Amino acid sequence: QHQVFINFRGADLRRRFVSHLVTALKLNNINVFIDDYEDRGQPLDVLLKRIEESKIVLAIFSGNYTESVWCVRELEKIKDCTDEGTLVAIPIFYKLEPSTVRDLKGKFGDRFRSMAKGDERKKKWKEAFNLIPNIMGIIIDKKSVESEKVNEIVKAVKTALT
């Protein structure tokens, strides 16, 4: 039923920038599935299956992304799918830089290191975060006009669909 999976964390993000992004995609007749952005405990196998069935994933990195072990395992799946070529991924950097993601800097990184302490999957996760930004994405920084960025993402999704 969906073409686009929107991968992210944060209730505030859901209610603000993502609400506008989802509205614009639906306005452009694009069907989307919204992530378990609050980690209520929606079954991981279903999320991963949703990701696999998608044509496009928007991986929206923000400061809250790395707090969730589940969100990080979704990224693993995103990366596996993109490597094999079964889906198209578009990284979105919401108020952070691609370098912050690839090098795990700042709050984004600190939260990752806190979450992944002692976890044997840590190295594979770092690699996913290092590599995904090698795909060309869209940056929303503190000085961006958000409506313009919504339009930018919608145009990219349409291009990827057609």
From Swiss-Prot:
Effect on the protein upon substituting residue 20 to A: Loss of TIR domain homodimerization. Loss of TIR domain heterodimerization with RRS1. Loss of cell death induction
Residue ranges annotated for the TIR domain, each copy included: 1-161
Q: What is the effect of changing residue 14 to E?
A: Loss of cell death
The listed outcome for residue 120 to A/K is: Increased cell death
**How does a null allele present?**
Loss of resistance to P.syringae expressing AvrRps4.
Q: What is the effect of changing residue 12 to A?
A: Loss of cell death
* Residues annotated for NAD(+) binding in this entry: 9-14
Region annotated Important for interaction with RRS1 sits at 19-20
**Which residues does the Swiss-Prot or TrEMBL record annotate as the active site?**
74
How is this protein induced? Up-regulated by AvrRps4 in an EDS1-dependent manner.
Where is it localised?
Endomembrane system; Cytoplasm; Nucleus
The entry's family comment says: Belongs to the disease resistance TIR-NB-LRR family.
According to its record, what is known about the domains?
A: The TIR domain is a signaling domain involved in cell death induction. It is involved in homo- and heterodimerization, but other domains also contribute to the interaction. The LRR domain may interact directly with pathogen-derived elicitors. The TIR domain mediates NAD(+) hydrolase (NADase) activity. Self-association of TIR domains is required for NADase activity.
The extra comment attached to this record reads: MOS12 and the MOS4-associated complex (MAC) are required for the proper splicing of R genes and contribute in the alternative splicing of RPS4. Only two amino-acid changes (N195D and Y950H) are linked to a change from a resistant strain (cv. Columbia or cv. Landsberg erecta) to a susceptible one (cv. RLD).
Complex formation: Interacts with EDS1. Interacts with SRFR1. Interacts with RRS1.
Q: What does this protein do?
A: Disease resistance (R) protein that specifically recognizes the AvrRps4 type III effector avirulence protein from P.syringae. Resistance proteins guard the plant against pathogens that contain an appropriate avirulence protein via an indirect interaction with this avirulence protein. That triggers a defense system including the hypersensitive response, which restricts the pathogen growth.
Q: What's the name of the protein?
A: Disease resistance protein RPS4
Q: Which organism is it from?
A: Arabidopsis thaliana
Which stretch of the full sequence is covered here?
15 to 176 of 1217
